[PDB]
Design a protein around this ligand. Structure first.
Ligand SMILES: Nc1ncnc2c1ncn2[C@@H]1O[C@H](COP(=O)(O)OP(=O)(O)O)[C@@H](O)[C@H]1O
Ligand SMILES: O=P([O-])([O-])O[C@@H]1[C@@H](O)[C@H](O)[C@@H](O)[C@H](O)[C@@H]1O
Ligand SMILES: [Mg+2]
Length: 273
Protein backbone atom coordinates (compact mmCIF):
# COMPACT_ATOMS: atom_id res chain seq x y z
CA UNK A 1 0.00 0.00 0.00
CA UNK A 2 0.82 3.72 -0.37
CA UNK A 3 -0.59 6.40 1.95
CA UNK A 4 -0.70 10.17 2.08
CA UNK A 5 -0.62 11.82 5.49
CA UNK A 6 -1.67 15.49 5.48
CA UNK A 7 -0.95 18.21 8.05
CA UNK A 8 1.79 20.30 9.62
CA UNK A 9 4.91 18.90 11.10
CA UNK A 10 5.62 20.78 14.32
CA UNK A 11 8.49 22.10 16.41
CA UNK A 12 7.39 20.85 19.77
CA UNK A 13 8.65 22.65 22.91
CA UNK A 14 7.91 19.95 25.51
CA UNK A 15 7.89 20.95 29.17
CA UNK A 16 7.70 18.29 31.91
CA UNK A 17 8.24 19.79 35.36
CA UNK A 18 11.20 22.13 35.24
CA UNK A 19 12.58 20.30 32.16
CA UNK A 20 12.33 21.65 28.58
CA UNK A 21 13.22 20.16 25.23
CA UNK A 22 12.59 20.71 21.53
CA UNK A 23 11.59 17.93 19.23
CA UNK A 24 9.83 16.96 16.09
CA UNK A 25 6.09 16.55 16.48
CA UNK A 26 2.81 16.97 14.68
CA UNK A 27 -0.13 14.78 13.77
CA UNK A 28 1.32 14.17 10.32
CA UNK A 29 4.67 13.04 11.76
CA UNK A 30 3.27 10.75 14.41
CA UNK A 31 0.59 9.20 12.21
CA UNK A 32 3.15 8.69 9.42
CA UNK A 33 5.54 7.10 11.94
CA UNK A 34 2.86 4.50 12.78
CA UNK A 35 1.88 3.87 9.17
CA UNK A 36 5.57 3.50 8.08
CA UNK A 37 5.48 0.03 9.65
CA UNK A 38 2.68 -0.98 7.25
CA UNK A 39 3.30 0.83 4.01
CA UNK A 40 5.14 3.40 1.87
CA UNK A 41 4.13 6.77 3.31
CA UNK A 42 4.19 10.26 1.83
CA UNK A 43 3.63 13.42 3.90
CA UNK A 44 1.95 16.54 2.57
CA UNK A 45 2.91 19.29 4.96
CA UNK A 46 4.17 22.83 5.38
CA UNK A 47 7.08 24.33 7.27
CA UNK A 48 9.88 26.87 6.85
CA UNK A 49 12.92 25.72 8.77
CA UNK A 50 13.57 22.53 10.69
CA UNK A 51 16.85 21.11 11.97
CA UNK A 52 18.74 19.04 9.42
CA UNK A 53 18.53 15.97 11.77
CA UNK A 54 14.72 16.32 11.93
CA UNK A 55 14.43 16.63 8.15
CA UNK A 56 16.57 13.45 7.88
CA UNK A 57 14.22 11.65 10.32
CA UNK A 58 11.15 12.61 8.20
CA UNK A 59 12.78 11.73 4.87
CA UNK A 60 14.05 8.39 6.24
CA UNK A 61 10.41 7.42 7.07
CA UNK A 62 8.51 9.19 4.19
CA UNK A 63 8.62 11.11 0.92
CA UNK A 64 7.92 14.79 1.76
CA UNK A 65 5.74 17.28 -0.11
CA UNK A 66 6.17 20.69 1.48
CA UNK A 67 4.01 23.72 0.83
CA UNK A 68 6.36 26.74 1.02
CA UNK A 69 5.99 28.83 4.19
CA UNK A 70 7.94 31.52 6.05
CA UNK A 71 6.90 30.03 9.41
CA UNK A 72 7.05 26.60 11.06
CA UNK A 73 4.11 25.51 13.26
CA UNK A 74 5.46 25.51 16.87
CA UNK A 75 3.56 24.25 19.96
CA UNK A 76 4.52 24.36 23.62
CA UNK A 77 3.14 21.32 25.45
CA UNK A 78 3.20 21.39 29.26
CA UNK A 79 2.62 18.05 31.00
CA UNK A 80 1.20 17.99 34.52
CA UNK A 81 0.73 14.23 34.36
CA UNK A 82 1.21 11.85 31.36
CA UNK A 83 -1.97 13.07 29.59
CA UNK A 84 -3.27 16.33 31.17
CA UNK A 85 -1.60 18.99 29.09
CA UNK A 86 -1.61 22.66 28.29
CA UNK A 87 -1.00 23.49 24.63
CA UNK A 88 0.05 26.92 23.45
CA UNK A 89 0.37 27.71 19.71
CA UNK A 90 3.43 29.95 19.21
CA UNK A 91 3.66 30.03 15.38
CA UNK A 92 1.68 28.56 12.41
CA UNK A 93 2.91 27.48 8.98
CA UNK A 94 0.97 27.91 5.72
CA UNK A 95 -2.49 26.36 5.12
CA UNK A 96 -2.68 23.26 2.94
CA UNK A 97 -5.00 23.98 -0.02
CA UNK A 98 -4.12 21.53 -2.77
CA UNK A 99 -3.88 17.75 -2.82
CA UNK A 100 -1.59 15.88 -5.14
CA UNK A 101 -3.29 14.17 -8.03
CA UNK A 102 -1.34 10.93 -7.64
CA UNK A 103 -3.15 7.83 -6.43
CA UNK A 104 -2.96 6.57 -2.85
CA UNK A 105 -4.60 3.62 -1.10
CA UNK A 106 -5.17 5.79 2.01
CA UNK A 107 -5.33 9.51 2.73
CA UNK A 108 -4.94 10.34 6.45
CA UNK A 109 -5.76 13.93 7.37
CA UNK A 110 -4.22 14.94 10.66
CA UNK A 111 -3.92 18.68 11.06
CA UNK A 112 -2.97 20.42 14.30
CA UNK A 113 -3.59 24.13 13.66
CA UNK A 114 -6.51 24.56 11.20
CA UNK A 115 -4.19 24.06 8.23
CA UNK A 116 -6.59 21.71 6.45
CA UNK A 117 -9.96 23.25 5.59
CA UNK A 118 -13.10 21.10 5.80
CA UNK A 119 -13.40 21.76 2.01
CA UNK A 120 -10.16 19.76 1.44
CA UNK A 121 -11.68 16.67 3.14
CA UNK A 122 -14.60 16.94 0.71
CA UNK A 123 -12.16 17.20 -2.29
CA UNK A 124 -10.22 14.25 -0.90
CA UNK A 125 -13.37 12.15 -0.43
CA UNK A 126 -14.00 12.59 -4.18
CA UNK A 127 -10.47 12.15 -5.66
CA UNK A 128 -9.50 9.32 -3.27
CA UNK A 129 -11.37 6.17 -2.19
CA UNK A 130 -10.17 5.83 1.44
CA UNK A 131 -9.98 8.84 3.77
CA UNK A 132 -9.06 8.75 7.48
CA UNK A 133 -9.23 11.81 9.78
CA UNK A 134 -8.11 13.06 13.18
CA UNK A 135 -10.36 15.90 14.33
CA UNK A 136 -7.86 17.73 16.55
CA UNK A 137 -6.67 20.44 14.10
CA UNK A 138 -10.26 21.13 12.83
CA UNK A 139 -11.68 22.24 16.19
CA UNK A 140 -8.77 24.37 17.42
CA UNK A 141 -8.84 28.12 16.58
CA UNK A 142 -5.86 29.43 14.52
CA UNK A 143 -4.53 32.40 16.62
CA UNK A 144 -1.50 32.51 18.94
CA UNK A 145 -1.77 31.39 22.52
CA UNK A 146 -3.23 28.96 24.99
CA UNK A 147 -5.43 26.98 22.55
CA UNK A 148 -9.17 27.60 22.22
CA UNK A 149 -11.77 25.19 20.83
CA UNK A 150 -14.45 26.02 18.19
CA UNK A 151 -17.40 23.77 17.41
CA UNK A 152 -17.83 22.56 13.82
CA UNK A 153 -20.57 20.83 11.83
CA UNK A 154 -19.68 17.21 11.15
CA UNK A 155 -21.68 16.59 7.94
CA UNK A 156 -18.56 16.94 5.73
CA UNK A 157 -17.14 13.81 7.47
CA UNK A 158 -19.83 11.55 5.95
CA UNK A 159 -17.93 9.01 3.88
CA UNK A 160 -14.82 9.18 6.10
CA UNK A 161 -13.61 5.64 6.80
CA UNK A 162 -11.90 6.17 10.16
CA UNK A 163 -12.10 9.22 12.45
CA UNK A 164 -10.33 9.69 15.76
CA UNK A 165 -11.06 12.18 18.57
CA UNK A 166 -10.13 12.15 22.25
CA UNK A 167 -13.02 12.68 24.71
CA UNK A 168 -12.55 16.47 25.18
CA UNK A 169 -12.38 17.06 21.43
CA UNK A 170 -15.50 15.02 20.59
CA UNK A 171 -17.90 17.39 22.35
CA UNK A 172 -17.01 20.11 19.78
CA UNK A 173 -18.30 17.90 16.98
CA UNK A 174 -21.96 18.34 16.03
CA UNK A 175 -24.43 17.42 13.32
CA UNK A 176 -22.59 14.17 14.03
CA UNK A 177 -23.55 10.60 14.86
CA UNK A 178 -20.95 7.80 14.81
CA UNK A 179 -22.49 6.11 11.75
CA UNK A 180 -21.35 9.05 9.58
CA UNK A 181 -18.08 7.08 9.36
CA UNK A 182 -17.19 3.36 9.07
CA UNK A 183 -15.11 3.56 12.31
CA UNK A 184 -15.10 6.20 15.04
CA UNK A 185 -12.21 5.89 17.54
CA UNK A 186 -13.13 7.81 20.69
CA UNK A 187 -10.20 7.68 23.07
CA UNK A 188 -9.67 8.90 26.61
CA UNK A 189 -5.90 8.70 27.39
CA UNK A 190 -5.04 5.92 29.88
CA UNK A 191 -8.79 5.42 30.61
CA UNK A 192 -11.27 3.19 28.78
CA UNK A 193 -12.02 4.20 25.21
CA UNK A 194 -14.84 3.66 22.72
CA UNK A 195 -14.81 2.38 19.14
CA UNK A 196 -17.85 2.38 16.80
CA UNK A 197 -18.11 0.06 13.77
CA UNK A 198 -20.96 1.33 11.53
CA UNK A 199 -22.30 3.11 14.60
CA UNK A 200 -22.34 0.05 16.86
CA UNK A 201 -20.41 0.73 20.03
CA UNK A 202 -17.45 -1.21 21.52
CA UNK A 203 -15.38 -0.32 24.61
CA UNK A 204 -11.63 -0.93 24.98
CA UNK A 205 -9.19 -0.69 27.91
CA UNK A 206 -5.67 0.50 27.01
CA UNK A 207 -2.44 -1.17 28.24
CA UNK A 208 -1.23 0.43 31.50
CA UNK A 209 2.09 2.29 30.97
CA UNK A 210 3.79 4.82 33.31
CA UNK A 211 4.80 7.82 31.18
CA UNK A 212 5.85 11.41 31.84
CA UNK A 213 4.18 12.57 28.61
CA UNK A 214 1.89 11.15 25.92
CA UNK A 215 2.69 13.41 22.94
CA UNK A 216 1.51 11.74 19.69
CA UNK A 217 -0.62 8.98 21.34
CA UNK A 218 -3.78 9.74 19.35
CA UNK A 219 -1.87 10.12 16.09
CA UNK A 220 -0.06 6.79 16.53
CA UNK A 221 -3.34 5.15 17.61
CA UNK A 222 -5.17 6.37 14.46
CA UNK A 223 -2.20 5.53 12.24
CA UNK A 224 -1.66 2.05 13.68
CA UNK A 225 -5.37 1.24 13.65
CA UNK A 226 -5.59 2.29 9.99
CA UNK A 227 -2.66 -0.11 9.30
CA UNK A 228 -4.05 -3.05 11.29
CA UNK A 229 -7.63 -2.55 10.05
CA UNK A 230 -6.39 -3.11 6.52
CA UNK A 231 -5.17 -6.62 7.43
CA UNK A 232 -7.12 -7.68 10.65
CA UNK A 233 -10.72 -8.09 11.75
CA UNK A 234 -12.03 -5.00 13.50
CA UNK A 235 -11.55 -6.18 17.11
CA UNK A 236 -8.08 -7.51 16.60
CA UNK A 237 -7.16 -4.30 14.81
CA UNK A 238 -8.38 -2.28 17.80
CA UNK A 239 -6.37 -4.45 20.20
CA UNK A 240 -3.23 -4.32 18.10
CA UNK A 241 -3.57 -0.50 17.70
CA UNK A 242 -3.77 -0.16 21.48
CA UNK A 243 -0.72 -2.40 22.02
CA UNK A 244 1.33 -0.62 19.30
CA UNK A 245 0.49 2.75 20.83
CA UNK A 246 1.44 1.42 24.29
CA UNK A 247 4.83 0.24 22.95
CA UNK A 248 5.34 3.60 21.19
CA UNK A 249 4.76 5.50 24.47
CA UNK A 250 7.44 3.75 26.43
CA UNK A 251 9.83 3.39 23.53
CA UNK A 252 8.88 6.76 22.03
CA UNK A 253 9.73 5.03 18.82
CA UNK A 254 8.28 2.43 16.42
CA UNK A 255 11.41 0.39 16.63
CA UNK A 256 9.93 -2.72 18.26
CA UNK A 257 8.92 -5.95 16.50
CA UNK A 258 5.42 -6.64 15.29
CA UNK A 259 5.61 -9.94 17.20
CA UNK A 260 5.78 -7.95 20.50
CA UNK A 261 2.76 -5.85 19.35
CA UNK A 262 0.79 -9.05 18.60
CA UNK A 263 1.77 -10.60 21.97
CA UNK A 264 0.69 -7.49 23.91
CA UNK A 265 -2.52 -7.11 21.85
CA UNK A 266 -3.76 -10.46 23.15
CA UNK A 267 -4.08 -8.82 26.62
CA UNK A 268 -6.19 -5.81 25.57
CA UNK A 269 -9.82 -5.99 26.76
CA UNK A 270 -12.53 -5.14 24.19
CA UNK A 271 -16.30 -5.51 24.79
CA UNK A 272 -19.24 -5.09 22.36
CA UNK A 273 -22.42 -3.00 23.05
N1 LIG B 1 -1.14 7.35 29.66
C1 LIG B 1 -1.44 6.32 28.85
N2 LIG B 1 -1.27 5.03 29.21
C2 LIG B 1 -1.58 4.02 28.39
N3 LIG B 1 -2.08 4.19 27.15
C3 LIG B 1 -2.29 5.43 26.67
C4 LIG B 1 -1.97 6.58 27.51
N4 LIG B 1 -2.28 7.67 26.83
C5 LIG B 1 -2.75 7.29 25.65
N5 LIG B 1 -2.76 5.95 25.54
C6 LIG B 1 -3.20 5.21 24.35
O1 LIG B 1 -3.28 6.09 23.23
C7 LIG B 1 -4.65 6.16 22.81
C8 LIG B 1 -5.00 7.57 22.34
O2 LIG B 1 -4.47 8.52 23.27
P1 LIG B 1 -5.34 9.82 23.75
O3 LIG B 1 -4.45 10.44 24.82
O4 LIG B 1 -6.68 9.23 24.08
O5 LIG B 1 -5.44 10.64 22.34
P2 LIG B 1 -4.81 12.08 21.99
O6 LIG B 1 -3.30 11.94 22.13
O7 LIG B 1 -5.33 12.49 20.65
O8 LIG B 1 -5.38 12.85 23.18
C9 LIG B 1 -5.49 5.72 24.00
O9 LIG B 1 -6.74 5.20 23.64
C10 LIG B 1 -4.60 4.67 24.60
O10 LIG B 1 -4.75 3.43 23.91
O1 LIG C 1 -0.60 14.08 21.18
P1 LIG C 1 -1.54 13.96 19.94
O2 LIG C 1 -3.00 14.12 20.24
O3 LIG C 1 -1.31 12.69 19.12
O4 LIG C 1 -1.03 15.08 18.87
C1 LIG C 1 -0.17 16.18 19.16
C2 LIG C 1 -0.78 17.41 18.50
O5 LIG C 1 -2.14 17.55 18.96
C3 LIG C 1 0.06 18.63 18.84
O6 LIG C 1 -0.47 19.83 18.30
C4 LIG C 1 1.46 18.47 18.31
O7 LIG C 1 2.17 19.67 18.64
C5 LIG C 1 2.12 17.20 18.91
O8 LIG C 1 3.43 16.99 18.33
C6 LIG C 1 1.25 15.98 18.64
O9 LIG C 1 1.22 15.74 17.22
MG1 LIG D 1 -4.90 14.06 19.48
Amino acid sequence: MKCLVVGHVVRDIVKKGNKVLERLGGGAYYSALALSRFCDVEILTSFSNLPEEWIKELESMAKLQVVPSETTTTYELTYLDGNRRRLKLLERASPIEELPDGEYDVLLMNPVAREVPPALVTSALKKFPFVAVDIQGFIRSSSPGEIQYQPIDGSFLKGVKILHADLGEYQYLQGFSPEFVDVLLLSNGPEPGKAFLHGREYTFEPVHVGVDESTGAGDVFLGAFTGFYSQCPFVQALKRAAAFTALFLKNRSVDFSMDDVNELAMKVEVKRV
